Design an enzyme around this catalytic site. Structure first.
Site, short mmCIF file in Angstrom:
data_model
loop_
_atom_site.label_atom_id
_atom_site.label_comp_id
_atom_site.label_asym_id
_atom_site.label_seq_id
_atom_site.Cartn_x
_atom_site.Cartn_y
_atom_site.Cartn_z
N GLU A 8 -5.28 -1.94 2.18
CA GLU A 8 -5.00 -3.22 1.55
C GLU A 8 -6.17 -4.18 1.65
O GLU A 8 -6.67 -4.45 2.75
CB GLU A 8 -3.75 -3.84 2.19
CG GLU A 8 -3.50 -5.28 1.79
CD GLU A 8 -2.31 -5.87 2.52
OE1 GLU A 8 -2.26 -5.76 3.76
OE2 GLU A 8 -1.43 -6.46 1.86
N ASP A 67 7.88 -5.34 4.83
CA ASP A 67 8.15 -6.57 5.57
C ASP A 67 7.84 -7.71 4.62
O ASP A 67 8.03 -8.88 4.94
CB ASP A 67 7.29 -6.65 6.85
CG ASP A 67 5.80 -6.74 6.57
OD1 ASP A 67 5.34 -6.16 5.56
OD2 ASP A 67 5.08 -7.37 7.38
N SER A 68 7.37 -7.35 3.42
CA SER A 68 7.05 -8.32 2.40
C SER A 68 8.38 -8.91 1.96
O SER A 68 8.42 -9.93 1.27
CB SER A 68 6.32 -7.65 1.23
OG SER A 68 6.90 -6.41 0.88
N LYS A 75 6.28 2.67 8.25
CA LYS A 75 4.92 2.22 8.05
C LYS A 75 4.53 1.34 9.22
O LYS A 75 5.18 0.34 9.51
CB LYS A 75 4.78 1.44 6.75
CG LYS A 75 3.34 1.32 6.27
CD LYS A 75 3.16 0.29 5.17
CE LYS A 75 3.32 -1.10 5.72
NZ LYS A 75 3.12 -2.14 4.69
N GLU A 116 1.54 -0.94 10.68
CA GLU A 116 0.30 -1.59 10.33
C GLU A 116 -0.63 -1.73 11.53
O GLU A 116 -0.22 -2.18 12.60
CB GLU A 116 0.58 -2.98 9.75
CG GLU A 116 -0.58 -3.58 8.99
CD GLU A 116 -0.29 -5.00 8.52
OE1 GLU A 116 0.83 -5.23 8.01
OE2 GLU A 116 -1.19 -5.87 8.66
N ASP A 175 9.11 -0.18 6.77
CA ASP A 175 7.99 -0.88 7.40
C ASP A 175 8.43 -1.50 8.72
O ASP A 175 9.48 -2.13 8.77
CB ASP A 175 7.50 -1.97 6.43
CG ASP A 175 6.10 -2.47 6.76
OD1 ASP A 175 5.36 -1.77 7.49
OD2 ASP A 175 5.73 -3.55 6.25
#
Ligand SMILES: [Mg+2]
Ligand SMILES: [Mg+2]
Ligand SMILES: [Mg+2]
Ligand SMILES: [Mg+2]
Ligand SMILES: [Mg+2]
Ligand SMILES: [Mg+2]
Ligand SMILES: [Mg+2]
Ligand SMILES: [Mg+2]
EC number: 2.1.2.11
Lengths: 248, 248, 248, 248, 248, 248, 248, 248
Positions: free
Chosen positions: D168, D45-46, D114, D116, D84
């Protein structure tokens, strides 16, 4: 090797090379015809019968075809895949026809579409052709003046931009001429031997559907029958405990 | 003649009759297997590969299956047609699974559906079964404790109401037992010979896809190859002006 | 500094300033080209290949582009961002084309759109242009009479209102003339050196895709290769426990 | 060669092989990392920042990601592609999360997703995992008791079924332990050197975004800068009539 | 035996064979009329009254008809099933009419549609006819100049392509002539005896609705009354414990 | 006169009055049964067969029923019209069932709905009943322990709130008891003579479908046959020019 | 008694019978006017004010009218119910107007619709009229040349097919003539006494809205005031415990 | 003056002030009742009968009410306008009920809603009340134990949060008590004189519907009759040329 493109069919008409077109409706079949050298594959509305069991080609919908086209497109990397437009999807006019064809290309992944019709469909063929969509025309003979109309259709259709045209159930004599009179290749099915190319529904070509091979169809095998024993033998071995064995 | 029903499979387990199940994805194929005597047809998600060219069964959607089911249903009037639930259509829970299955019955015309999963899917199987929807379970073996889970799944699945269960890639030994331990029929594919019934993807059974026949598959023919020549010969005759002839 | 506007390209044709246009498909890339001084950025449909892995530009949809346009628009505050209309979005006529372009401006935030086509597309170009939407035309050469058509297209396209036109795969000689014959700037790619401006897909320009640099492309670097080691070295250091260090 | 699967990451934790994970957002980039040997690719999502220019990862939508995933999936045939889940697509509960993940697999073609979150997300991870969807967890450290929570999250997340977990901004000390305490691989980014694997946003790894390389990032190159000259030189040559030449 | 087609009606006009058309709205009824030899079945808009209890044919919708058509189509395998277009579905023009008719064929499974109207509807009839959709016209007499218009309509309608035309409430004299003046068959209902064929709402034909048989209708039975006793007797036997018996 | 309400059925159970229920699917039929004194009309899903030609009751949809219900409601002003919930419309749970039933009342105009099922459906029956929607239950016998379940269902169903219950294919003995054991009326069909009321599909009751009257059905007439001659005679008179006459 | 039809209004113009038209917006009101003998009821868009409190007739939507029309249609079985087309529903052209009107007939149950406009609306009136939809025109006077236009409108409107026309705020002199010059009835409201019929908003006719009765309106009662006491007295009796009494 | 709020009704119960509630369904009516001093207006679902002609309150939809509510809200600036929830809009549970009520407030502009039901509806009343939506309950008496239930409902309903409750068709004795036993006001209609307030359908209160004034209703006038002459006289004057006069 080489991926067949429409210009190839044109060159072949020039070199006098008679090419073969086969109908296809799934990945596995297309894969076979591709590695068999068939240059052009037609995901026909004939799928209505052989694939879905409709007794006509009137009910089949775009959605019952696009997913099949995608499959055929994946199975024949070297063939020119043509998607046939379903009944009702283009008769309304260019706008409709264009939207339908666009779906077959952007979604189905087809390289070209087949639009059935005579003069009455020229407008549609022109719009698609101008849009950059290769169109394979499809004209027929419907009984005298009939032969005139067939000719008018053959002419109009080519004028509209069709890169080729299918002549179905057309008197071999008339077909012969039309073939010689058009600049674009003529693909026949029950049209006689004088056509730049030939097309058959693979089900008939390989005896996979029924047993009634019509006059214009030559039964090149009994793939259907071969499948019947395979199944019957499989069944018996299962019943006989012979299958599965241990190697299985 | 007689239209296979789920109770038939139960009787057969009693009479010790080992029945054969074949995968099918279109009208013409189903018609053949039907007149070949195959009692049960599976419109598997394996269609993802053999029909659509997906390298997995993850992408295939309900809409890429329902129309195929309808076709198979029309081609096999005597077979028990089972529709396979696509990945993602039943993992959410009973409500989702029920809606999906209901589509396959009301729309697809299927007689039963196949739900892949172990204990985690019992709730779904129960809801459908209670709704009056015949469910064929599908359990596997995923490597010790694994054999325990397979067993737990076999038990849970049957408890949920499944009228039968598919054992795929299950150690013949474990399979044998489970088969003897369950009241419902066990259909195997790479599960050994000790299963009330057997199932294979017709493409493999008749050598129609690739050439890599895995261990659990017995190649009962080369229907694919047979189709290659049929096509190749057809092509050459077209090029040789031999086809079409005049009888055409 | 100064934000490039269409009139700038016109002035430059007057002052004889040959400007460079680069293709861009994301924020980070656009940011680089912007601070590199590139005046015009093209969110091309070529993204179909370099961004999405399609082997053609036929499948890419408006929705696969608009979000990329927004990104490019945010990354190049000084560039004139041109959004490319996807296949099928404007061939139907002005109404369709207008709706599509309007999305790219109101949503994508683009400053102009690129409409590929010759005379057949003049109507569309006119509608957009009259609506206040800057249109960059795109004509080509498709083999004699071909050169005539290219010319007709160049003329028609400019008449329609295009503020500039792209000449792709056009014989340098013909290009040279057209360039001198048109009042609006000509942007070439494999069109020869006699064009008011040049355009290349940045992937090719910087060796980021494959290794086959076609004739009309000059490989100004091996940014792709440079990225390979960066990745390979990163990987090895990770394996070697060298990364991350403590400063990390 | 071999297509990386989740079990590979597990084996590697056993053999003590520290693997590298790189973020990727398009076909061309993925192709490079694939032929560079990177085993795991993250369509993060970066992308919100590096691809679309959002100053946060809050606005990016599923639709701004799926098309990118498809591209990455096509470019890295040997990598394990992880998609993500965007902010807001799974916080509502399992049902939501499952639907979202299912889209990424069936549509995006991803192999895993992914998710989070810490303990609060276990329910979601469990549902997906049970559905047969590989889930890569992602936990962090948010300042004492914090270290406890990180641990609780690491534990809960693994219990839920995650095949791996991303740490992270986690204190190297705490990370080291967690890594040794979990059965599943730990992928770090600013987590210290004691993690089964490492992950970086390729933009940072190759100096493609800004110049501010944070502490946890090692600049393995200046791919961005290299692109600036390529562009600048290209521009000047265009202006200098040096490009295109005749070979073009 | 033989499935009635439109050409049959034409031949019959030639051979002077007066055929009978009956209205039908469900599977069971159609089955009866089919095995009774009725060649043509009309799923009329008259269903609005006899089926749904509307006091007019204005409210009935396409959706209240299509499902009935499907039923009739399934019940009369040998009949030519004609689907009547509901009020409002074709008055807008060809495009609308075509879409509506297409639904009746592709979905309803009808073989032809009935479009009510005079000259004003020629355009619609032409579009459908050209699309390959058999259209049965329907003209009337609305009071002198009236007879002229009826004639104009009969002419226009046939010119448009209608394979036949219904004359409702038309003065026998005028009808006689029109019948002799048209090349296509004329089907009358209150049009006199000089029509190539006749049509009646089966409800009236068999005394199933009310008791008021209008002038143009001949009551061939009291099927309705027969049903009343059947019901009344059934009711009394239930009350009398006579039903069910033991054989039940 | 008097409009039948649910309480009437209750009073009748008290007074020992055995009432008759007939299935109905259209306006004209309902009108007849209404003026024939039938107190309760069932717009069954059996319509799937007799109305639409489905070989099962699995495919029929709510939309293929609601419009029929409206018709029946208009034709029987004195009858208690019960609308049958189609397969799949209530198995999901109360919410679904409530929405479906609500459609049948607010749209269809029905007075009550019939929900088929045993204990598993109590929750749904309770929700509707509590909502103020009269529910007629429907239980069966599916072969020992079976008789127990039937009883459990009869009990659960009544507990849920059903104002009456249908016993289909239930052993007369078991039925007799259940009838005596329940406070609410029992309506049988192949349930024996000991039920507060009886129900039959009018098509069977009046010999309108096929000729195979099963054991539980008594053929009170040959309304179907009567319709065949009416049609056949009509046809011949048309052919013989006897019809229409002049009075027509 | 007799149900008023459009032809009746025509006969009345011939016999010199001046008929009265009243506006109506609900079931109870319509019932009263029906049993009061009013032949024509107008579900006007004046409902915007009297029913919904809008200070104009610009905001009212079709959906705020159709349900009222249905009510009025149910309350006046003998009246000719005319539904008004809301602002914006027909100005776009025939297609729009036809769709809107069709809703009012098929859904609203109206017998005719009122389309406000002059020459500019002839096309719309023609389409509806040709579709079989009775249209009541509505023209006005908007200030010299004005009187010419009114005349042109009166003529055009009738030519288009309107079965009658409303003259609102038209100089009695001009009205008188137009009335004599047209073949169709003229319905006035502030048009003078020389109109085939008259129309008033019942609210004004019976003093139910405000107190300012404009010039063209004659206050035939104070139904509004009468309702005020009824309410006021009711209120006081409630407060005084006088109501309810025991008989209540 | 003062705009009635719910607390006012509470104060009035304290001061022993018996207030009157009147039903209203349009702007003009509301305006009258407002300037007549009526404190509370109910846009009842009784509108189903008096407004739309339904013979029940089962068919009326939210959409047939909201627009009426808006009108009433505009006409009674000082009244507390209560919107009724239509059948089926709240029985499903709180979520449904909340959504429905929210529409009536945000869209309809209502100040409160009326939810009909007993204990079974407490959950819904609680959710709305907690959401900040004023709820007026509505309980009844349905025949011994009945009186107990009525009481239970009165209690439960108030506990849920209802600011008041309607007692319809409740034995005056029981009503009296409940009134004294509850803290919130009781509004009766056929509940006896011992209720904090009274409510009547204005149509009955002013003799506007039929002539049969039931026991619990007191006919305070013949507003309906008054309207009949007004109409009849208007009609005759029109016929007699007396209207319009010249002042018109
Ligand atoms: Mg076709
Ligand atoms: Mg599967
Ligand atoms: Mg392009
Ligand atoms: Mg995030
Ligand atoms: Mg009609
Ligand atoms: Mg049923
Ligand atoms: Mg107006
Ligand atoms: Mg109510």
């Amino acid at each position: 090797r080489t991926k067949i493109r429409t210009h190839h069919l044109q060159r072949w008409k020039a070199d006098g090379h008679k090419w073969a077109m086969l109908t296809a409706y799934d990945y596995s079949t297309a894969r076979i015809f591709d590695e068999a050298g068939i240059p052009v594959l037609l995901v026909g509305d004939s799928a209505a019968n052989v694939v879905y069991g409709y007794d006509t080609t009137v009910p089949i919908s775009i959605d019952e075809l696009i997913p099949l086209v995608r499959g055929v497109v994946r199975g024949a990397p070297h063939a020119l895949v043509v998607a046939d437009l379903p009944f009702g999807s283009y008769e309304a006019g260019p706008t409709a026809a264009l939207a339908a064809a666009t779906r077959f290309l952007k979604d189905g992944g087809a390289h070209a579409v087949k639009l059935e019709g005579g003069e009455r469909v020229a407008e549609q063929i022109a719009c698609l052709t101008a849009a950059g969509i290769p169109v394979m025309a499809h004209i027929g003979f419907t009984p005298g003046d009939a032969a005139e109309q067939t000719i008018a259709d053959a002419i109009a259709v080519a004028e509209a931009g069709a890169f080729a045209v299918v002549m179905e159930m057309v008197p071999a004599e008339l077909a012969t001429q039309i073939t010689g009179k058009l600049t674009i290749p003529t693909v026949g099915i029950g049209a006689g031997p004088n056509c730049d190319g030939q097309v058959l529904v693979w089900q008939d070509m390989a005896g996979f559907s029924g047993a009634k091979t019509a006059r214009f169809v030559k039964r090149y095998a009994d793939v259907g029958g071969e499948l019947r024993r395979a199944a019957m033998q499989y069944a018996q071995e299962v019943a006989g405990g012979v299958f599965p064995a241990d190697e299985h």
